[PDB]
Design a binder for this molecule. Structure first.
Ligand SMILES: CC(C)(C)[C@@H](CC(=O)O)Nc1nc(-c2c[nH]c3ncc(F)cc23)ncc1F
Length: 150
């Protein structure tokens, strides 16, 4: 049971979710009603120029491993995963509604990427950390984001 979002074909590989219509507050203190998916799920994200493995819980991205043609393709996949995750820091970075959030971050993901948070990494090799400005790092990455070689 496959579906499409932001140019990516998502396929659930594990888990399940139930939906709950919920009201969330953006960084401008605007109320949006979104359909929240509750549960732990794992997906493949297949696009024309990037592919990824996403693991998420309710409104929380656990891990995203991205592969792609270049920085732009990879960033494009990261934006979709972050919006898809429904995380509160993604909603707070704003300063069908899922498509509206996506269209907003696609224009400029600078605030999304800053506000997301950064973490120290272990060096699983063949996977690199990526900084908010898309520079690769072997020490630090945006929370749960890893870049894999094509
Ligand atoms: C991708 C998008 C078009 C916005 C959503 C809208 C919806 O909730 O129906 N569509 C689908 N999401 C998920 C789905 C499954 N798990 C999810 N977790 C978070 C999330 F935002 C969506 C999902 N699964 C199947 C879908 F068709």
């Amino acid at each position: 049971s496959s579906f499409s979002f932001g140019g990516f074909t998502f396929k659930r590989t594990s888990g399940s979710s139930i939906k709950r219509e919920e009201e969330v507050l953006t960084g401008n203190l605007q109320t949006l009603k979104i359909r929240v998916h509750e549960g732990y799920e794992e997906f493949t994200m297949v696009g024309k120029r990037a592919t990824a493995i996403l693991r998420k819980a309710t409104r929380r991205l656990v891990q995203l491993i991205v592969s792609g043609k270049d920085e732009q393709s990879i960033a494009e996949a990261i934006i979709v995963a972050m919006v898809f995750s429904q995380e509160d820091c993604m909603i707070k970075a704003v300063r069908n509604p899922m498509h509206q959030l996506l269209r907003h971050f696609q224009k400029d993901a600078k605030v999304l990427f800053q506000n997301w948070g950064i973490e120290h990494i272990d060096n699983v090799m063949g996977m690199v950390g990526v900084l908010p400005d898309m520079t690769p790092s072997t020490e630090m990455s945006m929370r749960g984001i890893r870049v894999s070689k094509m």
